[PDB]
Homo-oligomer: A and B are copies of this chain.
């Protein structure tokens, strides 16, 4: 019953959400390279959490009787200017994923692929948090600015991120 088109559309978003994780992981290697262990953890946990959103979506596609192919994965950025510049790339990148989702939500309703539509809600519900929690840090990394005292303070705060 699921459409040929939809399975294709979804297959790009599985293979995109895997790219998200591979990116954040690179950011962990960057935050590992400038001594920030909490930021490393936050990303290390982000890398895991994104992986599971693709796997939730992988499973769904297999449940509805669609076949999942996996295409190659691009080289993520290995370098940034500073912590603030990394989180500006995060915020921007999740906002692009936010719209990439809203498109599937539209495709699902145009086809009346209801089962899919309800399933995607979880990602419409999720992204609000990923956007807002990115921005919360982006605003703060500006407000803190060049002071290292407060940067290491926020470093420890993000070390306690789990799941």
Q: Which residues of A contact B (CB under 8 A)?
A: 1-2, 22, 25-26, 28-29, 32-37, 44, 55, 58, 62-65, 67-76, 78, 95, 98, 102, 105-106, 109, 112-115, 117-119, 121, 124-125, 127-129, 131-132, 135-136, 139-140, 143-145, 147-150, 152-157
Contacts and interface: CB of A to CB of B under 8 A. Distances in A.
Given A1-B33, A64-B65, A144-B149, 7 more contacts: A1-B98, A25-B70, A26-B70, A32-B62, A102-B114, A144-B152, A152-B153
B29 A114 contact: no
Nearest to A149: B150
A64 B143 contact: no
Nearest to A71: B75
A140 B33 CA distance: 12
B148 A35 contact: no
24 contacts: A1-B95, A1-B98, A1-B131, A22-B70, A29-B70, A32-B68, A34-B112, A35-B139, A35-B140, A63-B132, A69-B78, A72-B74, A72-B75, A73-B73, A109-B148, A112-B148, A115-B125, A118-B152, A119-B125, A121-B121, A144-B149, A147-B148, A153-B156, A156-B157
Query: 3 tightest A-B contacts by CB?
Result: A35-B114, A73-B73, A149-B150
